[PDB]
Design a protein around this ligand. Structure first.
Ligand SMILES: COC(=O)N[C@H](C(=O)Nc1ccccc1CC[C@@H](CO)NCc1ccc(N)cc1)C(c1ccccc1)c1ccccc1
Ligand SMILES: [Cl-]
Ligand SMILES: [Cl-]
Ligand SMILES: [Cl-]
Ligand SMILES: [Cl-]
Lengths: 99, 99
């Protein structure tokens, strides 16, 4: 699809068999979701935002469907203001910016 | 152009007679630049995201050239870690997300 930016680019994602709403964010290097349960082991990660840095949990090789497109990659979990899909997964779904 | 997301989508901008590098950020509602002087009236604003909030100066009706495309809009100035071009100006240059 082609998504204009007059409104926030919010889409439905599916992770762990559940639907969630998430923002397609070209300004984010990584994908960070609000507190949730994910399988396996996690590693520590610090991510920097507009207000400073936060600690998150890094889970690797996680299945996630974004706007119907399947991806398998790194998902961070922590106190983000909104669920964010970052460039690590936008590249998997073949997303580009165009003007 | 078609901008890949393999790397951060950094482009050259021209504002207040200054050439700067800025990030095309679909996850940003507003445009926020690192400290600089801008003409006209301003009002304070708080913007928030990962790590919390920062205080910025809000300038309206500011002319900006983004990767050769002219746009006018509100520009926020403050302690952002990177210059961000948000949706308020991405729409003006006809920027869309495609996959
Ligand atoms: C050390 O930092 C880095 O290595 N990368 C930074 C990075 O990618 N952060 C990151 C990582 C995972 C998930 C989300 C984000 C930022 C979400 C932003 C992007 O959308 N929301 C902005 C926003 C949205 C809404 C509101 N209301 C307010 C703000 C990056 C940057 C930081 C701040 C702002 C823009 C980019 C960065 C890039 C280059 C140089 C330094 C930092
Ligand atoms: Cl942020
Ligand atoms: Cl990944
Ligand atoms: Cl505006
Ligand atoms: Cl349009």
């Amino acid at each position: 699809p082609q998504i204009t930016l007059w409104q926030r680019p919010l889409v439905t994602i599916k992770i762990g068999g559940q639907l969630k709403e998430a923002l397609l964010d070209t300004g984010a290097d990584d994908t960070v979701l609000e507190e949730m349960n994910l399988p396996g082991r996690w590693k520590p990660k610090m991510i920097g935002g507009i207000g400073g840095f936060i600690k998150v949990r890094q889970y690797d090789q996680i299945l996630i469907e974004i706007c119907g497109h399947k991806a398998i990659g790194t998902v961070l979990v922590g106190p983000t203001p909104v669920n964010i899909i970052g460039r690590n997964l936008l590249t998997q779904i073949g997303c580009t910016l165009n003007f």
